[PDB]
Amino acid sequence: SMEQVAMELRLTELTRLLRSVLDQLQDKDPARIFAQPVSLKEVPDYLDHIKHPMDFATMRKRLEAQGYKNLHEFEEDFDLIIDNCMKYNARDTVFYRAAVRLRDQGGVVLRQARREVDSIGLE
């Protein structure tokens, strides 16, 4: 149907905007601490601690499959990256501190992304 196509165009448009958001967020992680999933070979007990691992590569996979239906779902996954890190790692670590900085700087980006999704009406 034509209605189904219109919806798919909106989803495609949303995916385009989220791809830009993802690129902007990942630039706030120049150390690339959050680029890839935590290795279970190098951190064998990780899943005992963290029940829902997340990382930028995994987000990008879901994104290109148009698997984010709205901004909230995308933000949930970004929050997982930050929150997982701040639980597993102690305050005095380069990992924890990198997550704080990503959260603070990412807030700016997500604030205007929400305005754009609402304004252009992608959800």
UniProtKB/Swiss-Prot annotation:
The lineage of its organism: Eukaryota, Metazoa, Chordata, Craniata, Vertebrata. Scaffold subunit of various histone acetyltransferase (HAT) complexes, such as the MOZ/MORF and HBO1 complexes, that acts as a regulator of hematopoiesis. Plays a key role in HBO1 complex by directing KAT7/HBO1 specificity towards histone H3 'Lys-14' acetylation (H3K14ac), thereby promoting erythroid differentiation. This is Bromodomain-containing protein 1. Coiled coil: none annotated. Residues 9-113 form the Bromo domain. Component of some HBO1 complex composed of KAT7/HBO1, MEAF6, ING4 and BRD1/BRPF2. Component of the MOZ/MORF complex composed at least of ING5, KAT6A, KAT6B, MEAF6 and one of BRPF1, BRD1/BRPF2 and BRPF3. Interacts (via PHD-type zinc finger domain) with unmodified histone H3. Interacts (via PWWP domain) with dimethylated and trimethylated 'Lys-79' on histone H3. It is found in: Nucleus; Chromosome. Highly expressed in testis. There is a cross-link at residue 41 (Glycyl lysine isopeptide (Lys-Gly) (interchain with G-Cter in SUMO2)).
